[PDB]
Design a protein around this nucleic acid. Sequence first.
RNA 1: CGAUGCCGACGCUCAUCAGACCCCAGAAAAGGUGUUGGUUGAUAUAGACAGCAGGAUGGUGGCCAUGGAAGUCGGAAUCC
RNA 2: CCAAGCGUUCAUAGCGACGUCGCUUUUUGAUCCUUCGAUGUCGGCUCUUCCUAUCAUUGUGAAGCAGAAUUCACCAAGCGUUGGAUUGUUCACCCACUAAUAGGGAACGUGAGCUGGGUUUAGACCGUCGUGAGACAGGUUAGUUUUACCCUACUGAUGAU
Lengths: 190, 176, 199, 52
Amino acid sequence: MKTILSNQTVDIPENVDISLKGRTVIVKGPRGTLRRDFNHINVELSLLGKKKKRLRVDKWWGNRKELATVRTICSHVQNMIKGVTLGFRYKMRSVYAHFPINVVIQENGSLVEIRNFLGEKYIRRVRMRPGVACSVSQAQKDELVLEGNDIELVSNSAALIQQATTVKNKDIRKFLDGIYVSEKGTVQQA
Amino acid sequence: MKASGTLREYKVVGRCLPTPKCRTPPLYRMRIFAPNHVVAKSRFWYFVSQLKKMKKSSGEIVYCGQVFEKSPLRVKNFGIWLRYDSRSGTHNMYREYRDLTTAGAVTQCYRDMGARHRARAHSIQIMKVEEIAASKCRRPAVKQFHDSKIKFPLPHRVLRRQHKPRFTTKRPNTFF
Amino acid sequence: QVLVLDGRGHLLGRLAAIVAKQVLLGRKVVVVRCEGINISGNFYRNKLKYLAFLRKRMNTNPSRGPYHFRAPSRIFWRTVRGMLPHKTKRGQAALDRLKVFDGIPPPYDKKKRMVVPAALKVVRLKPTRKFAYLGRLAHEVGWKYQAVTATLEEKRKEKAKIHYRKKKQLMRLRKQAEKNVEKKISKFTDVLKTHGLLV
Amino acid sequence: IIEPSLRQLAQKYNCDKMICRKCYARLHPRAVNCRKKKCGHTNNLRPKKKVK
RNA sequence: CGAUGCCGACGCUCAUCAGACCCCAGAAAAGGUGUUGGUUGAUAUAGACAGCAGGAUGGUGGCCAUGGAAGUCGGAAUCC
RNA sequence: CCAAGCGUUCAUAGCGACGUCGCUUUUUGAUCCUUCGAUGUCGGCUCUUCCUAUCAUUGUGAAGCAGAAUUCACCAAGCGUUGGAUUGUUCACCCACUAAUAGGGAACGUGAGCUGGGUUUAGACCGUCGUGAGACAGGUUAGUUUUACCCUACUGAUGAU
Ligand SMILES: [Mg+2]
Ligand SMILES: [Mg+2]
Ligand SMILES: [Mg+2]
Ligand SMILES: [Mg+2]
Ligand SMILES: [Mg+2]
Ligand SMILES: [Mg+2]
Ligand SMILES: [Mg+2]
Ligand SMILES: [Mg+2]
Ligand SMILES: [Mg+2]
Ligand SMILES: [Mg+2]
Ligand SMILES: [Mg+2]
Ligand SMILES: [Zn+2]
């Protein structure tokens, strides 16, 4: 049954500055500027509140499927507020039994070379997504640190450098090797 | 039956035939919804024959009148007690509607069992219609209109009369 | 004396079904920009739908059986040809009035072109339903001149934006001459106002 | 040979899943219905056998 | 292809194999947290459903039947 | 499909009784609808294309997947699936190689394409049956395989608008 109104409301903090050209929410803050066009959802985004303390989304006459697109939007806008005010840090470890996974960062973080994965001679080169800066960290024997503003980019480049290192034609229950995302977090704390 | 047009709301009474034994039998009122009195008397006999040991030949129709609405200018909440058959079994139901007339809400119930359950007009058997207070309704599709300050926009006004300007210069507008 | 229909935003079978009647009514129709036409239903579905058409060839000599035109203009022409008696000299004469194009060639680039609101996608298609561009679909089913039509289209939009600015200018002048002259057109304006032409 | 906490990661991804007895899909641990259209989103799942 | 080029009514339905009208020209058992509508039964400010701990033991390692099965391999038991 | 059991344990890794629901027309039947002023009736050889119910190869999911080998399943018919002893064989069987030596269709593809070993005229032999002439999905041997120059299709060759 079509519901008359279904709406939510993200609460912007005073530190962020947000505007929208229709369904194109642009969010500017301490770390950058992120824009995510929502022209494929058919809702009403209102930048209500003076000084724009909050953003309110409305779906009028929406079936059950379209009522889902409400909280999805309100969660992407809060993941842009978060990735613009704090950042996205995808700390990830490397698990190897015998052959050490020798990883190296080129191009100032926009490319990763993985050598000696399972003692192979193929050097996996993985181009990062534009905006995602990988860097070997310290205090941890073998791990990487991915950093960025857009969670879709950070998480997808982590899925790229995780799926690149997969075991083939073996028993993936015994051959537990790879570069797995251990911790999802933020650049600066809160 | 066939729920043609809009159904009227008929009040049919009828009695068995007088005999030497029962010098006068009891009258039996029913509350039929049908296109016209000719179909209303036939559903009166369908029902009376399914309840009492009484047939159209063995009886007579004492009165078949249309009962109008007592407030056709007040939006009401009608609740109906269906009884219908599917391809496998027969089920009782209870459906609610917002309408102005009782026969209106019953027409909307025939078109609703037709839409949702593909039940032809002859499988359905209305057994009780009752105007319900807004605080006794159950279906959330009907409770949602019980608001005093209701407010909503018509958001995607698709252009009708697509063929009067059939060949036009400007493109259609849907925001209004 | 001619219809110039912009194919952008229109549905394929609805545009065809409407063109194939004016053409049969002795009216010369020119469908332009046949790569803006978009069919309903998700892309990959419409791909599998045209790939199945490609799979229907004459088994003994393919140089005879169904011809599968890969351009959007000729796909539209081919689908209008299904709504015509193209095996009679009044359906061949019909088809001889249709004239389909990709992009807007320069006979019709400088011409106001009509629209059929009985076949548009915004009008005929619920907003939450997917669709497939006939241009993209022709590119992924064997159309080669998509990247050429694209540049030749942007090179046109840049040229038309100048005309539209030189016309908003010719309408600011006229909107201010209708104020410098308002003193001596004051008697010719009320007569156009008491008859609903100028209100 | 390996550390047990780094073994918990790899087991969280490679071994700790559910399998659809009807299409052998690889579903997250808290799965009740398969996600593949080729089995009918069946509710007949099992745990991914643990290695020995 | 003659006739809806009605500002036709109300809902249902997304199919990466849709559907489309007596005879009729093609399908079933069994399924689905796809979605829509119903039926019965529970609990919910004596605060629920989720979500993030503790604690599951004394008798008892119960009697039983086994090479031994100790809250967990079998069976009547099934009480504090 | 359900799931009593099998599987050290554990119904569903892989299977599965008792039942039960379907698909196909490459098995044989049932029918007799078309053809008896004739549609050349078995195989093999040659040649094309198509099916997928996948043997191998590509990319993958699952195991009672340590590796190696091997089973189950998916998208998938692009590309392959052989050389020989015996038999007229289809089928079968064995040797050898191989990645694999999967199953099929097209008037049980294909005789104006071949062959003619089998079947299936007339000659003869043996066995059983019949008093006999003769009979035998019982063995044996010898036994005429015609025509395209027409129309289409296809292959190439002129040309036509
Ligand atoms: Mg192996
Ligand atoms: Mg057992
Ligand atoms: Mg004949
Ligand atoms: Mg002949
Ligand atoms: Mg012949
Ligand atoms: Mg298959
Ligand atoms: Mg043959
Ligand atoms: Mg022949
Ligand atoms: Mg011959
Ligand atoms: Mg011979
Ligand atoms: Mg002889
Ligand atoms: Zn599954």
